Enzyme design. Structure first.
Site, short mmCIF file in Angstrom:
data_model
loop_
_atom_site.label_atom_id
_atom_site.label_comp_id
_atom_site.label_asym_id
_atom_site.label_seq_id
_atom_site.Cartn_x
_atom_site.Cartn_y
_atom_site.Cartn_z
N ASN A 131 -9.17 4.92 3.03
CA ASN A 131 -9.67 5.78 1.91
C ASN A 131 -10.87 6.90 2.77
O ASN A 131 -11.36 6.30 3.82
CB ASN A 131 -10.45 4.82 1.00
N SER A 186 -11.98 10.28 -4.20
CA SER A 186 -11.44 10.04 -2.81
C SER A 186 -9.87 9.99 -2.73
O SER A 186 -9.37 9.99 -3.65
CB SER A 186 -12.20 8.67 -2.22
N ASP A 232 -12.51 8.34 -8.39
CA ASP A 232 -13.69 8.75 -8.03
C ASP A 232 -13.70 10.18 -7.02
O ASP A 232 -14.61 10.64 -6.42
CB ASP A 232 -14.43 7.85 -7.00
N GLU A 279 0.87 -1.20 -0.02
CA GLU A 279 -0.05 0.10 0.00
C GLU A 279 0.74 1.23 0.06
O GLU A 279 0.51 2.12 -0.86
CB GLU A 279 -0.94 -0.05 1.21
N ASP A 320 -6.67 8.00 -0.62
CA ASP A 320 -6.09 7.00 0.49
C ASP A 320 -5.02 7.58 1.09
O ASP A 320 -3.88 8.24 0.41
CB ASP A 320 -5.50 5.93 -0.34
N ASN A 349 -7.87 8.70 -5.72
CA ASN A 349 -8.73 7.61 -6.48
C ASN A 349 -9.38 8.34 -7.78
O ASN A 349 -9.67 9.60 -7.51
CB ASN A 349 -9.50 6.91 -5.56
#
Ligand code: CL
Ligand code: CL
Ligand code: CL
Ligand code: CL
Ligand code: CL
Ligand code: CL
Ligand code: CL
Ligand code: NA
Length: 129
Positions: free
Chosen positions: A59, A50, A48, A35, A52, A46
């Site tokens: 998220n 969002s 969309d 990650e 992380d 992301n």
């Protein structure tokens, strides 16, 4: 902060992640490797909108507030910035809520794709724990 492999394993064990929800420490170290490469300050946007955050790339859609994710929740009740601290307490506490949510560590797509079913004990091999 960029943790060393055994340094992070020790910190995760100190904060009670080892065998949390039945996931051995190597699962958690493996997830953090893919990650964030063990970097607490990792961020990734992301498609969309969002974001992380942190060592476990938690998220903003569900788990933390960053003020710029429309329609999102903040189920860990933390600013997403807390997830970037040298102190992993906020990331660990929030990860414990995520892994309790019903799909276990599958919540972390990198864990599912790169860690699940592999020899994850290799990630803690040699470490003084
Ligand atoms: Cl490594
Ligand atoms: Cl393990
Ligand atoms: Cl928001
Ligand atoms: Cl909320
Ligand atoms: Cl906030
Ligand atoms: Cl820490
Ligand atoms: Cl599970
Ligand atoms: Na949010």
């Amino acid at each position: 902060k960029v943790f060393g492999r055994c340094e992070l394993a020790a910190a995760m064990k100190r904060h009670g992640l080892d065998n949390y929800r039945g996931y051995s420490l190597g699962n958690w170290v493996c997830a953090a490797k893919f990650e964030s490469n063990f970097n607490t300050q990792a961020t990734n946007r992301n498609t969309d909108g969002s974001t992380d955050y942190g060592i476990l790339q938690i998220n903003s859609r569900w788990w933390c507030n960053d003020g710029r994710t429309p329609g999102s929740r903040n189920l860990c009740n933390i600013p997403c910035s807390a997830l970037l601290s040298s102190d992993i307490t906020a990331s660990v506490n929030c990860a414990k809520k995520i892994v309790s949510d019903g799909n276990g560590m599958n919540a972390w797509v990198a864990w599912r794709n790169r860690c699940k079913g592999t020899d994850v004990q290799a990630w803690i091999r040699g470490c003084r724990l």
